[PDB]
Every structure is written in structure tokens, then in C-alpha cells.
Write a protein that binds this ligand. Structure first.
Ligand code: HEM
Length: 402
């Protein structure tokens, strides 16, 4: 009937945001309408953006949107660099995506990750023992939040004990140290070779650790060795997400003492509280990886054309006022909490249950074992990551009673 003009293309420059402050450009986009168009610093052209919870679920779960097609051009994006390997799980669609996710799914369910909870709680107690022994102050990130997710994933992956410190080092060197280009990709090569060998060796394993599952799937020709190794590396270095996210968690718990006080007074609410924190924390800068409309799709009266790129903002979806009344309020009692901090659809985060487990153990040890714990700097003086994809502290200086 009546033409509905397309939205203006909104430029979305890379900006370093303080602490956990919400992106005001994303707020602007949320206020503009459910369907907007954006231009990011890198790649070319524009992309659709959806911000409402229902539209985000549609775009991420509907078969009419595809990931492989994203590598057919230079879609506008935040990251300077793009498309490493084209076997990367992120860029696969259900001809092949499903095989790869299925091969390890069992280790990452609630029941799957529960298998490493006691060992993980022990490893965390070791780290905290050491921090207490050294005495205050400490950088909680360096002392605890950084090493713990790596220890846990080593255990879940089934890395032989004598190789786990090599794993730590490799993980630290990969894309997150200094010595750009060279040491990172050499560490990546070593880790690749390592997992190629371990998974290869486990070609007929009935083990239930992740590398055994990968090895067995490779052995039954469900996936190739190359696919298995790539995924193994992604999973192995994925814990940095928990390091960053839990860093924001404790930054919040310490800068807003009432939250910490609630979790000490009512320990029973900690799982729900963690979910609320996961909902609220602005985990990333801007948006991540788009999907291509494989056929024309109408969203809120807007015609998304086949070939167009479409982004979702999980961050925005987690502040959807209809789904989350008073969305900017951190409410640990929040009634239903259907957040999409771990994404949605086939590409939903494999590590979500693992991240909740890690966060629950972390909150327990840090809130229960550090007497008089507080920030050692003003909240606004905690350094947060600049030029980042995933937001979070560079360091989290804390102090307490020795
Ligand atoms: C609280 C911490 C974490 C958060 C907030 C998080 C969030 C996310 C999000 C938003 C996505 C994208 C979903 C999409 O493409 O639509 C994702 C993907 C992914 N995450 Fe995480 N993640 C976390 C921890 C982890 C950990 C610890 C691991 C490693 C076990 C991991 C492994 C992955 C993988 C492999 C993918 C790609 C999945 C696929 O495309 O099939 N994540 N994550």
C-alpha cells in the first residue's frame, strides 16, 4: 500500500566505553525502531540491525538466514581483520555446523559441565589460597579470573596434566599478549599441532572429555581432523570470555556493595543473581558476526532483501523493556529471565553452561573467602580494555584484611 522509507544508515564508530556503561549509539539505535541500518568502521557498505528480543530470536534461529554466505563479501564489521579459516564453526551452516556442534554437545550441557565442578572448585581454591598467602593487594584478574577458566577448560578438554601449563602459555600468547602477528600465530600453530595429535590419538576413544569426543567423531568420519582441531582451539581459548565477563561481574559487585551484600546474605540466590548479571553486563563492543538473508524476509514491515547482511544485538535484546521490565535494573530476583547473553539459535554459545558453572564457583570463593574484600581503586579508576571486541577489565585491583 504505502511506502515505508528505509531507515537512514547510522555510522557506528569504534568507541572505548568506561567500565560497564551502555553504548549510547546502541541506545540511539534501540530508540529509532526495531529495524535499523548501520555502518561499522571496517568492511564495506551497510547492514540491517535488529534490537528487539523477538526479532533477535527470529534472525538467529530462522533457516532463512545463513552464516556461510557472510564470507562471500566484505560485510560492514567492527573488527579490522576477518575470516581466518572457513571451516570455523561460526561460519558453518547446518550442512556441516550441526555435525561439528553435535560432536561435543554432550560435554557442554548442564550435566556435561557438572562433571568438572568438584575438580574446578578445588583448582579455584588453590588459586585463592595462593592469593591470600601472598597478601593484599592483588589484581583479581591476574591472580584468579584469568587462570581459572583456562584450568577448567583443560580439565573439560581432557588435556594430559603434564601439558596443561604448555596450554596455559599458548592460550596467553594467542591473540592476547604482545608481539603482534608472530608469537600469536606461532602459539596458534603449536596448539593446532598439539590438538591434531591428541585428537588423532583418540580416534577410537570412548572417553567423555572433549578431545576424546572429537577424536571418536573423527574416527567415525562424522567430522574431519581439521574441523575437530579448529573447534578444539576455539573452545580452549574461549575462557577469556569468562575472564572478561566475570571481571565485569566483580567490578559491579564491588562498586555496588548492595549487590555483594545480597549475595552474602542470601547465598541461595547466587545462581539466579549470576543469570541476572549475565543478562545485564554489556559483554561486547557493538555487534559481532552477521547473517545473510538467503531469501526475502519481512521484519516489522521492513523488507530484508536476499543477500542483505543482518546483525543482531544480544545486548540490546537483553534490555528489551517488554521482556525485561525495568531492563536497566539489576534485579537478582528477576521473575522469568530469558536472556540471550549466550546467543540464540544453532550458533548459541557452547560454553554457556560452563560459563555459569565457572561464574558460580568464582562468586562463591571470592565472596566467601576474602575477608573485607573491596576495590583498591575508585571504581572509575579500574582500567577497562580499549580497542576490544569483548569488553572487560584489563586489571581488577582489590584489597582486603590480611
Ligand atoms: C559469560 C561468557 C560467555 C559469553 C557471554 C559468550 C557469548 C557468546 C555469544 C554471544 C556467541 C555468539 C552466538 C552467535 O553467533 O549468534 C558465542 C559463541 C561461541 N562461544 Fe561463547 N560466550 C561465553 C563463553 C564461552 C566459552 C567459555 C567458550 C569455550 C568453551 C565459548 C565458546 C563459543 C563458541 C565455540 C562459539 C561459536 C558457536 C557457533 O557459532 O556454533 N564461549 N558466545
Amino acid at each position: 500500500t504505502i511506502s515505508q522509507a528505509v531507515p537512514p544508515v547510522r555510522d557506528w564508530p569504534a568507541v572505548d566505553l568506561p567500565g560497564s556503561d551502555f553504548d549510547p549509539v546502541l541506545t540511539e539505535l534501540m530508540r529509532e525502531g526495531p529495524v535499523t541500518r548501520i555502518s561499522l568502521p571496517n568492511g564495506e557498505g551497510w547492514a540491517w540491525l535488529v534490537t528487539r528480543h523477538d526479532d533477535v530470536r527470529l534472525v538467529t534461529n530462522d533457516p532463512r538466514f545463513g552464516r556461510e554466505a557472510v564470507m562471500d563479501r566484505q560485510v560492514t564489521r567492527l573488527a579490522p581483520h576477518f575470516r581466518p579459516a572457513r571451516g570455523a564453526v561460526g561460519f558453518l551452516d547446518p550442512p556441516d555446523h550441526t555435525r561439528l556442534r553435535r560432536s561435543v554437545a554432550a560435554a557442554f550441557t548442564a550435566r556435561g559441565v557438572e562433571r568438572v565442578r568438584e575438580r574446578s572448585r578445588g583448582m579455584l581454591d588453590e588459586l585463592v589460597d595462593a592469593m591470600l598467602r601472598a597478601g593484599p593487594p592483588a589484581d583479581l584478574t591476574e591472580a584468579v579470573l584469568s587462570p581459572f577458566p583456562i584450568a577448567v577448560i583443560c580439565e573439560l578438554m581432557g588435556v594430559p596434566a603434564t601439558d596443561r601449563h604448555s596450554m596455559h602459555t599458548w592460550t596467553q600468547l594467542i591473540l592476547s599478549s604482545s608481539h603482534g602477528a608472530e608469537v600469536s600465530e606461532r602459539a596458534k600453530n603449536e596448539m593446532n599441532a598439539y590438538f591434531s595429535d591428541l585428537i588423532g590419538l583418540r580416534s577410537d576413544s570412548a572417553g567423555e572429555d572433549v578431545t576424546s569426543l572429537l577424536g571418536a567423531a573423527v574416527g567415525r568420519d562424522e567430522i574431519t581432523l581439521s574441523e575437530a582441531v579448529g573447534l578444539a582451539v576455539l573452545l580452549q581459548i574461549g575462557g577469556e570470555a569468562v575472564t572478561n565477563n566475570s571481571g565485569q561481574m566483580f567490578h559491579l559487585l564491588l562498586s555496588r556493595p548492595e549487590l555483594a551484600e545480597r549475595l552474602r546474605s542470601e547465598p541461595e540466590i547466587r545462581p539466579r543473581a549470576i543469570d541476572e548479571l549475565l543478562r545485564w553486563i554489556p559483554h561486547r563492543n557493538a555487534v559481532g558476526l552477521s547473517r545473510i538473508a538467503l531469501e526475502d524476509v519481512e521484519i516489522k514491515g521492513v523488507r530484508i532483501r536476499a543477500g542483505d547482511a543482518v546483525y543482531v544485538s544480544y545486548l540490546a535484546a537483553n534490555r528489551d523493556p517488554e521482556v525485561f521490565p525495568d531492563p536497566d535494573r539489576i534485579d537478582f530476583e528477576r521473575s522469568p529471565n530469558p536472556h540471550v547473553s549466550f546467543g540464540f539459535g544453532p550458533h548459541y554459545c557452547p560454553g554457556g553452561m560452563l560459563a555459569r558453572l565457572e561464574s558460580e564457583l568464582l562468586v562463591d570463593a571470592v565472596l566467601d573467602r576474602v575477608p573485607g574484600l573491596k576495590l583498591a581503586v575508585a571504581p572509575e579508576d579500574v582500567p577497562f580494555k580499549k580497542g576490544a571486541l569483548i569488553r572487560g577489565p584489563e586489571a581488577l585491583p582489590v584489597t582486603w584484611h590480611h
